[PDB]
Design a protein around this ligand. Structure first.
Ligand SMILES: CC(C)C[C@H](N)C(=O)O
Ligand SMILES: CC(C)C[C@H](N)C(=O)O
Ligand SMILES: [Mn+2]
Lengths: 254, 262, 261, 261
DNA sequence: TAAATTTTCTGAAAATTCTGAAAATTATC
DNA sequence: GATAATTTTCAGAATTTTCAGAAAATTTAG
């Protein structure tokens, strides 16, 4: 019982202290207290984290790990489990152990634990071990981590959607204020500007498309105001441009 | 089994976390909803306070003093002494007796609950002390598994507090940054024109004649239009042309008039 | 047994010609198709949505529960039974009477002990559009009956998908039209439309435009120009009654929405 | 043989989901539907319209190379064969080589003496929408094969009917818009519209509206208001270029037609 | 026919988008 | 610093735009 409390404290410090799929590292944390390999999948099937703590046989695993994508079939199979399942044998297709070697670990047992945020399935955790099976304390720890990770996923996803919605509203609000010639100039300049940042000469392109140089300057200022870009004058070397809002080039090409 | 009951209790709290997040609600005692569940699952009285003492949730399921204690619940503020006493403990301290000053039971009525037991758990949402949970029970003691469950509840509540504060901080800072970024793109004459225009408007919205102000401050009429357009781009204002009646303006960003006068 | 199957599939194909011509005021569109399917299968047939809203039915056999007749009248199946059948991914046939997915009343479970039931789900794109329920006294469903059942299931599924896609696209096009209209009104014109249709307080009627214009401090001609810009986009239908005022009729239903927004 | 038939019908039902869209700007949209049908029946399959336009095909087996390839490339079957199959009215199967309705080339008839072919007509709302043609060497079509063939036939028939209904409805909406808009312009506004779009001499461009207004003795406000009435109905897209005039773009293609009328 | 409205057409003050010269800016040598 | 090549600020005008305002034109009841 004391060790259980210690493990819960270990995980509390660990997890609490764009992350580029952090959960992989987080999986290691979950493994340590349970001394087992861990896998984490989303509701769509996209792999979001894994840790091969024990002596695995690489192969498709090495790749599914490298490619950051689990086999579509197994991931779409676990999504319907609804509630927790424990001590699943090796002969079952729901096993975490690679089937390439089922004779190597017949004693292995595996577990599936679903993740739920605000009442919707956010993902699933998978654990696997040998010799002794998962008892209740291990399930307590598993669901502890499940709920914590559920809330972290919900937080990151809500923040990301809010960010993209604000950025898209900004882009639309800005483009709806540009004039005809200003919009043509924006198209021309950002078509010449290969990439999100660089340097170019605005007056030359302005002469190439038949628009007065001041109109282009004013357009770039209307964009700077709404934070879509950040312009800086290089004098005789031209103007330097950097795109801050990422939803801009898409709505422009559209 | 002790472990079986523990697992069942953790599941009972998980199911409420799923549907009762109530993330839209930011009303007085947001977590009190969270407090009720914890009081029931432990079959004990529960209180939730901030590091300063502001009450955020409570449940007097069992027999309480009420006469002198109800004043704290109604005013939603615990006594400064007890809160500053719980602030001294770094880590969890459980099965505290009544003779200790850390007791959750009333000092008015101490002989009514001679065997009463109480537990105190500090809260650290972001590795920083945000508050503390207080539990109180009669005779039945706290074993190890219940401590696991208590710290479970502490950790869950931490992130809800973290979000409640983070959203507003980011929102207000975003509002101020928008105005700063917009004003930093106007030229000297354009900025002077904005100052003149919004001092002449004297309101959150209204109507005026831009050409008149332009002639009054010695700036070309087109510069005012262009400046208001630079503001429209950033969603700071909403301008509408009324032709012979002038221009209509509406201030969307509330941090704008403030950043101008300063 | 196979020739009769082909004949029945052809008999269902033949009726699609006349059934495609539909009237929304019938309140029971697929009912015709339900009768057809009941007839070739000599069985009770029901068609429900994913939520339980009834879309078609036929009482070949006796239900002996005035409680079920009401279900037909109210055009709503019990939410519990619908939520039980909604979980079925694929077709299930020859369902006994003891099962809760049975179409028979719980009053009469021993009254029709041999009764069998079949459930066929309807799908389109990646979502469930509804469900078909078949029920029989003693006689069982064989494989050929299931072939015919799924034939009808697919036909009705795609007809439902088309009707709903048509409705959705129509209303979204109408809403884009309204937005395009308000984006051309001026400040005073937009305020004027608000005033007039708030004073109209209905879907159609008659009023005096000059009075309202004077009441809100706007020139009378501005009202005319705004309402004409609305008529141009087919959003309304205005006609001048001279000294009796103007008559207005709202054609586009998505208009009041863009105003209230 | 009934279970096997049910299995085949279930796999094709599973395939109906995949399409999951209706823009379908493809050269031979039903070609996908043809491929599936070709595989399950292990026979060559062709899908043509009532006029002969090819809509989908799969040449699994040997067919003439030179002249028959032009039918696939040009996407048009010979007028004689199409008008011969349009007369069939009902399904006919196991058609020998001596019949003119044969799917095999008449150049190479001595290569495939036993080849058989089947024709299935497509019907929407009592109208022939097209025809499916199937061809096998030696092996014949049984009753279950016809059940499956007509199963696919009805699906493709309703898909054709839906796409065609959408095309007609779109053009009718476009035609109604121009008349509904022009019926709201006044005399002077109509004169201005005529003058401006005769001056534009094209589908899009730039001009000076005030100049034209003075040139025909009409107030500039009339032109602005008329172009606003047109913008409201999405007939055009105007944008102000200030000192450079007004920019115009014609969205509705039936507009210039109704003006020249 | 006459009141009682609704449309049409004219006028004018203002707003707006664009050209183009004078002034500030950065950079190279 | 000196000079070239840009960027930016600033003044201006042709045009567009919106609204106000009096005829005309239009129904309805008479
Ligand atoms: C279709 C339903 C009315 C049947 C169900 N067994 C009931 O009696 O409620
Ligand atoms: C092309 C075939 C489908 C028709 C006909 N048998 C011919 O050879 O032209
Ligand atoms: Mn006049």
């Amino acid at each position: 019982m004391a060790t259980l409390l210690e493990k819960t404290r270990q995980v509390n410090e660990l997890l609490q202290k764009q992350a580029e799929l952090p959960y992989n590292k987080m999986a290691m944390i979950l493994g340590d207290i349970l001394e087992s390999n861990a896998y984490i999948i989303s509701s769509s099937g996209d792999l979001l984290g894994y840790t091969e703590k024990l002596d695995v046989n690489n192969a498709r695993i090495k790749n599914m790990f490298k490619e950051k994508k689990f086999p579509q079939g197994y991931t779409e199979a676990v999504d319907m489990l609804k509630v927790t399942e424990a001590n699943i044998p090796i002969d079952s297709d729901l096993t975490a152990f690679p089937f390439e070697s089922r004779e190597l670990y017949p004693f292995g047992l595996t577990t599936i634990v679903p993740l739920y945020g605000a009442g919707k399935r956010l993902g699933t955790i998978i654990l696997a071990r040998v010799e002794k099976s998962f008892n209740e304390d291990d399930l307590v720890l598993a669901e502890y981590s499940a709920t914590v990770v559920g809330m972290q996923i919900l937080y990151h996803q809500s923040r990301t959607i809010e960010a993209e919605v604000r950025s898209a509203t900004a882009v639309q609000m800005a483009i709806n204020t540009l004039s005809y010639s200003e919009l043509k100039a924006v198209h021309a300049i950002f078509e010449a500007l290969d990439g999100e940042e660089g340097r170019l000469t605005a007056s030359s392109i302005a002469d190439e498309i038949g628009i007065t140089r001041s109109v282009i300057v004013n357009a770039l200022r209307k964009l700077e105001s709404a934070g879509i870009i950040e312009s800086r004058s290089l004098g005789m070397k031209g103007t330097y441009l950097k795109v801050l809002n990422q939803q801009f080039i898409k709505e422009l090409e559209k």
